[PDB]
Design a binder for this molecule. Structure first.
Ligand SMILES: CCCCCCCCCCCCCCCCCC(=O)OC[C@H](COP(=O)([O-])OCC(O)COP(=O)([O-])OC[C@@H](COC(=O)CCCCCCCCCCCCCCCCC)OC(=O)CCCCCCCCCCCCCCCCC)OC(=O)CCCCCCCCCCCCCCCCC
Ligand SMILES: CCCCCCCCCCCCCCCCCC(=O)OC[C@H](COP(=O)([O-])OCC(O)COP(=O)([O-])OC[C@@H](COC(=O)CCCCCCCCCCCCCCCCC)OC(=O)CCCCCCCCCCCCCCCCC)OC(=O)CCCCCCCCCCCCCCCCC
Ligand SMILES: CCCCCCCCCCCCCCCCCC(=O)OC[C@H](COP(=O)([O-])OCC(O)COP(=O)([O-])OC[C@@H](COC(=O)CCCCCCCCCCCCCCCCC)OC(=O)CCCCCCCCCCCCCCCCC)OC(=O)CCCCCCCCCCCCCCCCC
Ligand SMILES: CCCCCCCCCCCCCCCCCC(=O)OC[C@H](COP(=O)([O-])OCC[N+](C)(C)C)OC(=O)CCCCCCCCCCCCCCCCC
Ligand SMILES: CCCCCCCCCCCCCCCCCC(=O)OC[C@H](COP(=O)([O-])OCC[N+](C)(C)C)OC(=O)CCCCCCCCCCCCCCCCC
Ligand SMILES: CCCCCCCCCCCCCCCCCC(=O)OC[C@H](COP(=O)([O-])OCC[N+](C)(C)C)OC(=O)CCCCCCCCCCCCCCCCC
Ligand SMILES: CCCCCCCCCCCCCCCCCC(=O)OC[C@H](COP(=O)([O-])OCC[N+](C)(C)C)OC(=O)CCCCCCCCCCCCCCCCC
Ligand SMILES: CCCCCCCCCCCCCCCCCC(=O)OC[C@H](COP(=O)([O-])OCC[N+](C)(C)C)OC(=O)CCCCCCCCCCCCCCCCC
Ligand SMILES: CCCCCCCCCCCCCCCC(=O)OC[C@H](COP(=O)(O)O)OC(=O)CCCCCCCCCCCCCCC
Lengths: 59, 187, 98, 380, 318, 53, 50, 93, 41, 49
């Protein structure tokens, strides 16, 4: 913080290169539509708790 | 009525003392019911302020002569010995404050006064409580009640302080004008 | 030397070899950081160690030079009524602003 | 000769009540030879070799077969009956070790045995090393009376010193034998496991073999120890409770909690100087270097050795360190002190020192010592 | 939910014992090879840990199975020590079920639609499982040693040829019957963790999915998947430590990494391999536990439904 | 009580501020101790009511 | 009160073991400038009271 | 900044910028760097030598061996009366 | 040493804290247009 | 608004009055000049030049 001058050094090695990392989170990325829709409808019980339940006629 | 919850079952000591003081100042409770409560309050204050003075000599005679106390005294700095003595005295004083028989008697007398108030004014005893100001304690409210009692029973009950007897006009509430309107604001 | 950013000639100059401050004898206690600021924990740039550690020149000493003698001499100028005038004007402006 | 004692408490002081001012003890008729004060008990060797241990007899200390307070001085029966002269004595937290003139070494006191049959030792053994004492018996069993340490001879040894629960012996050949609890590098052997039986220090042996450095002496207090080698350098190892080790390069870095292996002290303030001697107290380390220069570390003030600003005109003869205090005695008998070491100070004060009053002791202060809350002076 | 239970019929002690014994027997017979593969993978990874990266992080159960089968013993090599495993499992089930049923009968609520809270049920199950595991530890030790024999070098093998033979060899060679309880504490911890980390998540997810999708048939199996996954996650480290302790040979020289106890084994595992080392063979463990639980639940539910129908309970009561 | 100091007057804080600073520090310490005691007694009462009863 | 007092304090001891050459250790009696913190606090809060 | 000291507290004013357990401020709480000599005019010293001379002469009239001399004012002012064995209370008037 | 596992855990804690700081600096407090665009996406 | 208006008014009044000198005294050697000037509330404030 308060020990380094605010500047960019001449050497090009200081360039911030992007390197791929762990791939586990991309599983959740790929499954996001399923997870998001499940949260929207099943988890929040929208629009109601009976729409997604197996239909049974009244007694 | 062992299983019946009284209206003030959740009131703290400060709230109960404030209710007693409010009833007395509004003249719902007469001066003839105070003396027992005042005596109990004074006894409780005396006991609370005198307990450590009597306890510390007892600790010197009994506890501080025990094996562990002597070990601490002889094997640790005098400052640490003083700290231990102060800590034990403070713990004993806190225990006394929590479980004093005099405090229990004062609370019982307050309960009796609250029961009398409930009998006199039905369920409206709950109307005597308000948002008590912070840092005002039950001891302070008891002191205020004692001061009001002294003022009303003193020589200046009509010269310097208001009298205990009520001279409110005899009117009919159902027809007498009111100072406030239910919804609107009057002129 | 700093391999990623430094050079072969990045040689620091010793503090004892840094030039001394001789501009004036009067001290500059601003460098110290007053006890009020220290207690408040306020961070000031004037009394920051890193900024005070200049590379080539020493910052002035917080205390006055030993050469100076602060024994009172004789009075040259004296206009004491300025204090009364200032009090009057300040109180008047405060009252008017209120 | 006569003894003088003071301190915060009166456990090993020989009296029943504490006294900040020194109090004169003449129970020994001017025949006191050596004195070792531990945290809670003291041991005195007279001229004729008689040993007197007094103070708190916890864990069978004092060699009396009891576990009660014995404040008044009392002879050690085991040695007095056999007329076996004691050459040196080391006193720790709850143990005592005696080295006789014939080389025999005896010990008695705490050994690491559990206090009671019910405890959390089951959980403690899975986290910390098994408790062990400074006894060379080979088992965690308290010794209520002096007992010889098997296969341990100390004849001509350079030095012997012990901490709270560990001991070390440096011989004439430079060999260092340590025993007790080596946790947090208290013994400097690089292992935290307890050493029930004496063992040769592999680290010091390797140093002597490769670098040719010989251990001049070792002094320990609490869970900290400092060693002076052939070269004018001090090496500290143990628990750095208050910066005693003096190994903090950067004052703001709390990376000096403990040193498993002997680490050299910071030589920033005495570059080119050789340490003449050193003294270790519960939370302090004070050493004199051949420029007649005193340096100190500890007391939560100096995490690296810094120079004490006492005058250097008179050569410093003796040094003493103790909890939050220390002192230096010069040739002329003048005693400089950091914090209330003696307990009496004159109006002469300096930037970071005071002058102990000479009226406290009736005579010339031959020796000073004491490192755990209680301090003593041998005056002839 | 505190009154949503329907405990209208409770099996007798003899019925519980017999049904549990038979169902656990067939379940163990079916799912034993997976446990064998898991134990072999744990043994072969002991002291090294997972060194692959990303998708390859771990040990392939299929690779382990193929390597074991290539030895030339066929499928009979995966059932080595099955007698000891079955005897130990049967003893554990008998003791645990007897203790749990006795305690539950003693402390059951009066109402039929009320059941003990999950906390109390878990406490009872953990106590029973720990007691049973302590009682039947030697059988597990013998079975694990027999399994690890193949993985370990021949000079380090024990060469047991049956439960009784292994017990006798351990008692005699190692000296004293106390050697039969090696790893008993680890086994007790594993049993307690497994008992407490199965019945909770299952009910949790079963009720939640019933609320979401109503009364269906896949709810039970989805809840079973969830509960098996979480039970594996919670229990696998303890199973790994127990396997390491069992595989520790008596002679310190034989052991590649000697351990002195549960804490010592955990410390050594952490030192020589990351915290992930506790989860070697996780896929095999999950498959084993899920298959065992599924077969047991299916058979028990079918038999219990038949018994309830014979008794004469209503459709909703069943 | 640290560094061998046995008097309040031997502190630079007292040098700069003095008795008022000492009173402020004492009040702050007492307030935090009072709050700690209150929360501790509350926790003990909660434990007694829930875990035991 | 300050009859027997050392001219150094904790800050001086800490400064003696640092590279900050722009500060010096106090070597004069503190009685001359006793309670200067109060005056500094007054200077800091003088414009904020009203 | 956990178990590893990267930044230098000697070049920082406050070490609390980032969470850590291995940093301590150089200027701890209760430490206040203050100049040992302020810019305050000192009281006139014109009559101090005369006062010292008169007092020392009067005190030497009673303690000839006290060694009270004007030349020793710089060093005598640092000592107390008890150290000099002079009871100033009696002779103050 | 008697706390090799504890040393490994301390290294893990240091790594996690450093990673937290790095993530906060690079993805939360950053002003890089490309990173802002990725977060926008 | 109230706080900052009061602060600005007082500070700028002090700045305006700072220039004027109330008292000036040489040192014994006439090397320094002690100057007493007006304070924010109209009291004396010391400075050295
Ligand atoms: C840094 C950590 C941070 C926190 C995370 C923790 C991570 C841990 C792992 C990684 C780190 C390393 C480990 C550190 C452990 C530290 C704690 C510790 O000390 O534990 C060690 C402790 C013990 O380990 P150990 O010292 O290695 O010893 C175990 C050995 O395996 C024992 O050897 P064995 O297996 O061969 O056992 C042989 C067996 C030999 O058998 C014997 O006991 C022999 C003597 C008895 C014989 C008779 C038995 C009965 C039969 C006869 C009855 C009478 C006759 C009846 C009639 C006739 C018919 C029978 O012995 C035993 O039974 C057990 C040993 C004790 C025996 C002595 C007597 C015990 C009496 C009391 C118990 C009695 C019942 C026992 C059985 C259970 C009930 C059924 O283990 C644990 O505590 C397990 C781990 C921790 C569990 C708690 C969870 C903590 C974390 C919570 C989450 C925190 C998250 C937030 C972060 C917090 C940060 C602080
Ligand atoms: C990470 C991403 C960060 C960046 C963001 C990225 C983007 C994502 C954003 C996400 C935003 C949030 C999304 C959700 C919305 C917010 C939540 C919400 O509204 O949900 C409604 C919220 C969540 O509850 P719910 O899902 O509706 O279900 C409530 C029901 O009552 C059900 O109650 P029940 O009694 O039926 O529960 C049965 C219980 C039965 O489970 C058992 O089997 C427990 C007993 C045996 C355990 C044996 C384990 C042995 C492990 C090895 C040995 C120990 C060392 C290992 C470490 C563990 C020990 C420290 O198991 C369950 O709870 C099943 C579901 C959870 C899965 C199981 C794993 C966790 C179990 C809890 C203990 C472990 C916690 C570890 C730390 C936290 C990890 C996330 O409902 C409530 O308002 C009630 C909450 C009740 C209290 C729990 C609160 C949550 C957990 C707090 C921390 C607990 C720490 C315990 C350990 C402490 C140290 C000792
Ligand atoms: C010979 C003839 C003699 C005739 C008699 C007359 C002449 C003789 C002389 C008379 C002298 C009169 C002196 C009057 C003042 C003192 C007494 C008084 O009013 O007490 C207040 C208080 C008034 O309450 P109350 O009206 O009676 O109501 C009691 C009811 O039962 C129910 O009430 P509650 O208990 O629920 O309420 C407790 C408390 C509600 O709780 C609180 O609000 C307290 C919050 C924490 C305060 C912490 C303050 C720091 C000092 C703490 C105490 C000392 C250290 C203790 C260390 C303990 C551990 C060792 O209520 C209050 O008292 C509220 C007062 C709030 C105002 C505080 C004033 C400022 C304090 C900070 C000053 C420094 C910073 C600012 C400076 C500003 C300068 C301009 O008295 C008590 O009731 C206290 C009872 C005893 C408790 C002892 C607890 C343990 C500590 C003592 C043992 C250790 C001592 C160690 C040192 C020993 C050597 C010194
Ligand atoms: C594709 C599924 C796996 C996703 C993995 C990656 C994302 C992390 C996991 C997200 C949740 C996955 C679904 C199961 C848990 C849902 C819990 C929940 O809150 O739902 C309650 C909700 C409704 O609960 P509720 O309405 O009673 O109350 C929720 C809480 N309040 C009160 C605040 C509203 O139920 C559902 O939405 C139904 C979900 C059915 C899912 C069936 C398929 C999965 C079951 C088998 C899983 C096996 C593997 C283990 C899980 C994955 C690995 C860990
Ligand atoms: C009285 C006369 C009337 C007729 C009487 C009945 C005739 C004899 C029947 C004998 C048993 C036949 C079935 C044996 C098992 C399956 C076939 C076989 O060879 O396996 C042996 C396999 C072994 O095969 P293997 O691979 O080891 O064979 C030798 C391999 N080489 C040549 C490389 C050496 O299993 C075993 O023997 C060990 C495990 C047995 C116990 C566990 C069984 C688990 C599976 C049970 C479920 C059903 C499985 C079959 C599913 C498909 C058919 C529905
Ligand atoms: C710093 C480290 C310190 C470590 C040592 C000191 C701390 C120890 C802390 C231990 C915590 C134990 C928690 C148990 C699990 C509770 C989890 C929970 O509440 O989950 C929610 C649920 C709550 O369920 P519920 O009953 O409220 O209902 C759930 C349904 N709804 C939500 C609708 C109400 O509890 C569980 O599922 C817990 C199941 C397991 C219970 C048994 C735990 C183990 C008991 C062992 C007993 C002894 C065995 C024998 C020992 C022999 C040797 C002595
Ligand atoms: C819907 C929302 C609710 C969800 C509930 C369902 C469960 C949610 C679970 C969330 C947590 C997920 C954790 C994933 C673990 C990692 C998985 C993985 O594959 O990574 C492995 C990796 C690496 O594991 P490894 O270290 O074993 O790697 C092995 C390395 N070789 C192969 C070389 C041997 O894990 C990590 O890098 C660390 C993961 C844990 C991070 C923990 C962060 C918090 C830490 C707080 C500490 C506080 C301490 C305070 C005390 C004082 C400290 C000084
Ligand atoms: C976050 C707050 C908590 C406190 C601070 C953090 C401290 C704890 C940090 C833990 C980090 C995670 C450690 C485990 C990392 C495993 C990585 C991994 O997957 O390895 C590859 C392994 C390899 O397994 P495999 O060998 O089957 O490989 C299969 C894959 N092939 C075939 C390709 C080889 O993968 C798995 O096992 C996947 C599941 C991992 C699950 C990890 C759960 C860790 C839980 C630890 C505590 C116990 C549970 C408590 C909560 C639930 C119960 C109540
Ligand atoms: C649940 C209540 C149990 C009863 C006891 C509760 C209080 C326990 C207080 C001590 C805990 C350890 C503090 C660190 C000691 C140390 O050496 O601290 C320093 C050492 C590391 O030394 P280094 O400085 O060399 O790294 O730390 C450890 O070894 C930490 C190991 C993990 C400890 C987890 C917490 C304790 C687990 C419960 C069992 C404890 C049994 C032993 C109790 C004495």
């Amino acid at each position: 913080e308060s020990e380094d001058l605010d500047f960019q050094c001449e050497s090009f090695k200081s360039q911030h290169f992007r390197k791929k990392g762990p791939i586990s989170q991309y599983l959740i990325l790929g499954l996001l539509p399923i997870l998001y829709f499940g949260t929207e409808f099943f988890y929040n019980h929208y629009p109601d708790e009976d729409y997604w339940r197996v239909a049974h006629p009244p007694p | 009525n062992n299983l019946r919850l009284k209206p003030w079952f959740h009131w703290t000591d400060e709230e109960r003392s404030h209710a007693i003081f409010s009833a007395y100042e509004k003249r719902i409770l007469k001066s003839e019911d105070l003396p027992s409560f005042l005596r109990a309050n004074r006894i409780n204050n005396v006991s609370t302020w005198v307990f450590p003075l009597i306890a510390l000599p007892l600790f010197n005679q009994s506890i501080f002569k025990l094996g562990f106390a002597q070990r601490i005294l002889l094997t640790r700095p005098a400052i640490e010995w003083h700290c231990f003595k102060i800590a034990t005295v403070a713990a004993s004083w806190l225990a006394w404050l929590n479980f004093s028989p005099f405090y229990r008697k004062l609370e019982n007398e307050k309960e009796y006064l609250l029961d009398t108030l409930e009998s006199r004014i039905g369920i409206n005893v709950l109307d005597l409580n308000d948002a008590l100001p912070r840092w005002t304690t039950s001891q302070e409210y008891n002191r205020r009640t004692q001061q009001l009692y002294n003022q009303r029973n003193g020589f200046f009950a009509g010269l310097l302080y208001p009298q205990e007897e009520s001279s409110r006009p005899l009117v009919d509430i159902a027809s007498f004008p009111k100072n406030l309107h239910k919804e609107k604001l009057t002129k | 030397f700093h391999h990623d950013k430094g050079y072969k000639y990045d040689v620091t100059t010793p503090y004892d070899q840094r030039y001394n401050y001789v501009a004036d004898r009067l001290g500059h206690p601003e460098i110290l950081g007053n006890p009020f600021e220290r207690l408040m924990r306020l961070e000031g740039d004037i009394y920051h160690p890193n900024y005070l550690d200049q590379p080539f020149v020493k910052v002035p000493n917080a205390n006055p030079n030993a050469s100076l003698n602060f024994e009172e001499g004789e009075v040259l100028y004296e206009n004491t009524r300025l204090l009364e005038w200032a009090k009057f004007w300040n109180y008047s402006v405060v009252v008017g602003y209120l | 000769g006569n003894l003088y004692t003071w301190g915060q408490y009166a456990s090993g002081t020989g009296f029943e009540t504490a006294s900040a001012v020194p109090r004169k003890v003449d129970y020994f008729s001017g025949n006191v030879s050596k004195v070792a004060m531990g945290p809670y008990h003291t041991a005195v060797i007279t001229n004729d070799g008689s040993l007197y241990t007094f103070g708190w007899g916890q864990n069978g200390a004092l060699g009396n077969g009891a576990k009660e307070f014995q404040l008044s001085p009392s002879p050690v029966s085991f040695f007095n009956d056999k007329k076996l002269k004691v050459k040196d004595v080391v006193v720790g937290e709850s143990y005592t070790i005696a080295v006789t003139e014939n080389g025999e070494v005896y010990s008695w006191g705490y050994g690491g045995e559990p206090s009671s049959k019910i405890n959390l030792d089951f959980f403690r053994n899975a986290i910390l090393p098994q408790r062990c004492g400074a006894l060379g018996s080979g088992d965690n069993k308290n010794r209520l009376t002096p007992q010889q340490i098997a296969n341990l001879k100390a004849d001509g040894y350079k030095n012997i010193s012990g901490g709270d629960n560990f001991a070390t012996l440096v011989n004439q050949s430079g060999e260092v034998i340590n025993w007790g609890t080596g946790l947090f590098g208290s013994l400097g052997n690089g292992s935290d496991y307890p050493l029930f039986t004496p063992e040769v220090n592999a680290y010091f042996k390797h140093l002597k073999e490769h670098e040719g450095l010989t251990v001049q002496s070792i002094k320990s207090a609490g869970h900290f120890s400092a060693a002076l080698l052939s070269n004018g350098k001090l090496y500290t190892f143990g628990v750095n409770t208050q910066g005693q080790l003096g190994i903090r390069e950067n004052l703001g870095h709390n990376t000096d909690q403990n040193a498993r292996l002997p680490t050299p002290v910071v030589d920033r303030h005495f570059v080119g100087q050789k340490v003449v001697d050193f003294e270790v107290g519960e939370n302090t380390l004070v050493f004199l270097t051949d420029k007649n220069e005193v340096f100190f570390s500890g007391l939560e003030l100096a995490y690296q050795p810094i120079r004490w600003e006492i005058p250097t005109d008179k050569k410093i003869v003796k040094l003493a360190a103790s909890k939050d205090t220390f002192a230096a005695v010069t040739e002329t008998g003048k005693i400089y002190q950091f914090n209330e070491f003696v307990g009496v100070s004159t109006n002469e004060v300096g930037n970071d020192y005071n002058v102990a009053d000479s009226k406290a002791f009736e005579g010339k202060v031959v020796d000073l010592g004491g490192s755990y809350g209680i301090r003593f002076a041998i005056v002839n | 939910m505190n009154y949503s239970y329907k405990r209208y019929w409770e099996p007798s002690t003899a019925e519980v014992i017999g049904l549990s014994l038979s169902v656990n027997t067939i379940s163990a017979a079916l799912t034993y090879p997976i446990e064998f593969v898991k134990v072999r993978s744990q043994i072969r990874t002991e002291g090294v840990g997972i060194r692959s990266k990303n998708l390859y992080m771990g040990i392939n159960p299929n690779k382990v199975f193929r390597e074991i089968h290539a030895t030339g013993n066929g499928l009979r090599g995966f059932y080595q020590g099955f007698e000891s495993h079955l005897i130990g499992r049967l003893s554990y089930l008998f003791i645990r079920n007897l203790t749990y049923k006795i305690i539950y009968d003693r402390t059951k609520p009066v109402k039929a639609h009320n059941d003990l809270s999950h906390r109390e049920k878990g406490v009872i199950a953990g106590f029973a499982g720990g007691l049973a595991a302590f009682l039947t530890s030697p059988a597990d030790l013998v079975n694990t040693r027999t399994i690890a024999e193949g993985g370990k070098p021949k000079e380090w093998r024990w060469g047991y040829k049956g439960l009784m033979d292994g017990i006798n060899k351990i008692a005699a060679t190692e000296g004293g019957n106390a050697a039969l309880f090696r790893g008993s504490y680890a086994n007790v911890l594993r049993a307690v963790i497994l008992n407490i980390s199965l019945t909770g998540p299952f009910d949790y997810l079963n009720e939640k999915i019933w609320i979401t999708f109503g009364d269906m048939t896949w709810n039970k199996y989805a809840a079973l998947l969830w509960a098996s996954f979480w039970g594996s996650v919670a229990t696998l480290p303890f199973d790994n430590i127990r396997t390491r302790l069992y595989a520790q040979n008596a002679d310190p020289t034989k052991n590649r990494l000697t351990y002195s106890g549960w804490a010592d084994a955990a410390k050594k595992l952490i030192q020589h391999e990351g915290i992930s080392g506790f989860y070697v063979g996780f896929y095999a463990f999950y498959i084993r536990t899920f298959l065992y639980a599924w077969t047991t639940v299916f058979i028990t539910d079918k038999i219990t439904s038949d018994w309830k129908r014979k008794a004469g309970l209503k459709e909703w009561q069943i | 009580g640290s560094h061998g100091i046995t008097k309040i007057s031997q502190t630079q804080f007292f040098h700069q501020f003095g008795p008022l600073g000492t009173l402020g520090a004492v009040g702050f310490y007492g307030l935090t101790a009072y709050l700690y005691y209150k929360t501790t007694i509350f926790t003990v009462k909660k434990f007694y009511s829930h875990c035991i009863l | 009160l300050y009859l027997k007092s050392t001219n150094y304090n904790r800050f001086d001891y800490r400064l003696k073991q640092t590279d900050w050459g722009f500060y010096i250790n106090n070597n004069s009696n503190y009685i001359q400038n006793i309670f200067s913190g109060l005056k500094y606090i007054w200077r800091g809060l003088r414009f904020w009271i009203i | 900044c956990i178990y590893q000291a990267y930044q230098n507290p000697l070049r920082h004013i406050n070490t609390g910028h980032n969470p850590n357990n291995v940093y301590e401020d150089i200027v701890m709480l209760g430490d206040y760097p203050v100049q040992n000599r302020t810019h305050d005019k000192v009281i006139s010293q014109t009559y101090v030598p005369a006062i010292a001379n008169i007092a020392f002469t009067h005190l030497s009239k009673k303690y000839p061996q006290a060694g009270l001399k004007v030349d020793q004012l710089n060093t005598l002012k640092e000592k107390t009366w008890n150290d000099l064995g002079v009871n100033i209370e009696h002779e103050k008037q | 040493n008697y706390f090799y596992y504890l040393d490994r855990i301390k290294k893990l804690f240091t790594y996690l804290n450093d990673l937290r700081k790095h993530i906060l600096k690079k993805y939360v407090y950053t002003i890089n247009h490309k990173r802002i665009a990725i977060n926008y996406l | 608004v109230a706080i900052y208006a009061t602060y600005i008014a007082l500070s700028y009044i002090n700045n305006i009055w700072k220039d004027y000198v109330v008292r000036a005294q040489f040192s014994k050697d006439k090397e320094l000049l002690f100057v007493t000037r007006v304070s924010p509330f109209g009291t004396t404030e010391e400075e050295v030049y």
